[PDB]
């Protein structure tokens, strides 16, 4: 089985600045007819594969020339002369030339942009889920950069870890930001039993985290 | 130019099969191309399975062995995968693809279909509207969601006002707990057009047929 090795395994790349990856097998791709069977695809957040460049070198169907490819043998390199958001995504190497078929692990290209500090919302339980004895309470923490960010839940100023899931998204193409949602799940019995609840959010644009509480029974 | 799209159950019981089908549009399957079934494990890892090509022609991975087969159905111009023997090692998204067998080039990919290899129960979702609180209601812009939950298996389809909405949305990846999964979407609207322009939350969950259309009500007096 032929390894497709690529790296890096993640980049951070300016809006306009070149990117360049590589992808190096363990045979060489060349086949009997002077053809290469190397392509390279993209795979944008929730999207599937797309097609960049096929041939080793070159473009496919209706592909921008903004991409590149290149090499032989077994190194194979991919540039992009100048980065849009929307470039943003997984990229690929396959090669088509050993059977059977192989894939390389993937290069994660992030977009880089001003810091920019997260919106927070804080949602109380719905009234039809506190019929069902169940009771969760929603945070959102939305368009922020960069990536890292955490979220503390406190019960009437006592913190609580317990019960807490979470969710990121994938950066968004639209403006370059990450978003996070931060649900905290109790009983409907000890939710009435508590008053407050705090939803709070530390990241780098701040040096104080963001702040958002309701109390319970109170608009 | 050639468009194709997988359909086929997304949920199937340990050790038995999993079964695919791919229709391929604006363009004949006995022409030109070797139609592929590629799957993406949950970390992100693609594997070949193998393919068909115009002239009926197969090839899977041996990493497979005997458990797969491809085939196809040319008066309805369509390919098939079948998967047997499964277990929870199978739970990934399944893609059909179309690659010239000249060059590779053309390379076409399906929607995907999400599969589960599970013997958990399929489960509806109850849709919880999320009302922002009265204090965060006095700014520019308003942030309003929706709380789908406890649902199995994947997946759902989540848009607001019938997808005339889609500008300030944020729909985060389901994170699953006990076999049911739970997943949140967030929406962003100018605070002086809520609640004049009321805000739905229109939720589907193909696996149990079921439709949820929550109107967001604020808090208080409605």
């Known amino acids: 089985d032929v390894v497709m090795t690529q790296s890096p395994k993640t980049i951070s790349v300016t809006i306009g600045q070149p990117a360049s990856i590589s992808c190096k097998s363990s045979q060489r791709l060349l086949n009997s007819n002077g053809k290469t069977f190397l392509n390279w695809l993209l795979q944008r957040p929730g999207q599937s594969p797309k097609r960049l460049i096929y041939?080793?070198?070159k473009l496919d169907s209706g592909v921008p020339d903004r991409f590149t490819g290149s090499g032989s043998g077994t190194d194979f390199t991919l540039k992009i002369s100048r980065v849009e958001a929307e470039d943003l995504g997984v990229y690929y190497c396959?090669?088509?030339?050993?059977?059977?078929?192989?894939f390389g692990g993937g290069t994660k290209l992030e977009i880089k942009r001003a810091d920019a500090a997260p919106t927070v919302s804080i949602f109380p339980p719905s009234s039809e889920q506190l019929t069902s004895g169940g009771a969760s309470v929603v945070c959102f923490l939305n368009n922020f950069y960069p990536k890292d960010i955490n979220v503390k839940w406190k019960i009437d100023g006592s913190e609580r870890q317990n019960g807490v899931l979470n969710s990121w998204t994938d950066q968004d193409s639209k403006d370059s930001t990450y978003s996070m949602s931060s649900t905290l799940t109790l009983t409907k019995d000890e939710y009435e039993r508590h008053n407050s609840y705090t939803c709070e959010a530390t990241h780098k644009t701040s040096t104080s985290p963001i702040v958002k509480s309701f109390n319970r029974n109170e608009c | 130019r050639v468009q194709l799209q997988q359909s086929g159950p997304g949920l199937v019981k340990p050790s038995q099969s999993l079964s695919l089908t791919c229709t391929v549009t604006g363009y004949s399957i006995t022409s030109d191309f070797a139609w592929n079934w590629i799957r993406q494990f949950p970390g992100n890892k693609l594997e070949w399975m193998g393919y068909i090509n115009y002239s009926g022609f197969t090839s899977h991975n041996p990493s497979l062995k005997s458990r797969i087969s491809i085939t196809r159905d040319t008066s309805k111009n369509q390919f098939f995968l079948q998967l047997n023997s499964v277990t929870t090692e199978d739970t990934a998204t399944y893609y059909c693809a179309g690659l010239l067998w000249y060059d590779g080039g053309a390379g076409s990919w399906g929607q995907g279909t999400l599969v589960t290899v599970s013997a958990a129960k399929t489960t509806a979702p109850s849709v919880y509207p999320l009302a922002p609180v009265c204090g965060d209601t006095t700014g520019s812009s308003v942030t309003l969601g929706c709380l789908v939950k406890g649902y199995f298996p994947e997946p759902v389809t989540l848009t607001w006002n019938s997808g005339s909405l889609s500008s300030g949305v944020h729909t985060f990846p389901a994170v699953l707990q006990s076999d049911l999964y739970t997943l949140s979407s967030s929406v962003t609207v100018t605070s002086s057009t809520w609640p004049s322009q009321s805000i739905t939350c229109n939720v589907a969950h193909p696996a149990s047929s079921t439709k949820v259309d929550k109107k967001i009500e604020p808090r208080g007096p409605t």
């Open positions: 041939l080793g070198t």
């Open positions: 396959w090669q088509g030339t050993h059977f059977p078929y192989t």
